[PDB]
Amino acid sequence: LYFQGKVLSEGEWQLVLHVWAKVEADVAGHGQDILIRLFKSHPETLEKADRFKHLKTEAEMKASEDLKKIGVTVLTALGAILKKKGHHEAELKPLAQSHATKHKIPIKYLEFISEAIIHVLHSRHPGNFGADAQGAMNKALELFRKDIAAKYKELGYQG
């Protein structure tokens, strides 16, 4: 039965979740592709992670047990958020905690990984990631970035 979303229409939410079902069907693989994409597009994002220190080649990145683990974590977290269809206040709080504090991840970087996600999804899911699903995923990820930036402020992180 129906569970009312926010901001996006029920149809847009269905587009976002339908792709995401495909992502989670190969979460490690998509995590790898997305982070590698992120790191190649914006190397700065590498620098901030010390378990990503001696990572210099793709070969090295695909080999990395840690990059694989963190990819699953980031994508299962984002999946959980998106499945809330905007009702994600409570899920952002601990995320915002650890990312504002322990990891120090700027909002800029969430834009970076947003592009990476869109790019990899576009390139792997022609079936379910047509223009409409991509516009929908952009709204979902924008709403996420907006709501987490507010949560940072509620915690003084210049982000």
From Swiss-Prot:
Alphabetical list of InterPro entries matching this protein: Globin (IPR000971), Globin-like_sf (IPR009050), Myoglobin (IPR002335)
Residues the record lists as binding heme b: 99
Phosphoserine PTM positions: 9
UniProt-annotated binding residues for nitrite: 70
Keywords: Cytoplasm, Heme, Iron, Metal-binding, Muscle protein, Oxidoreductase, Oxygen transport, Phosphoprotein, Transport
Highest taxon listed in the record's lineage: Eukaryota
Any one Gene Ontology molecular-function term assigned to this protein's record: heme binding
Residues with the Phosphothreonine modification: 73
This protein's name: Myoglobin
Source organism: Physeter macrocephalus
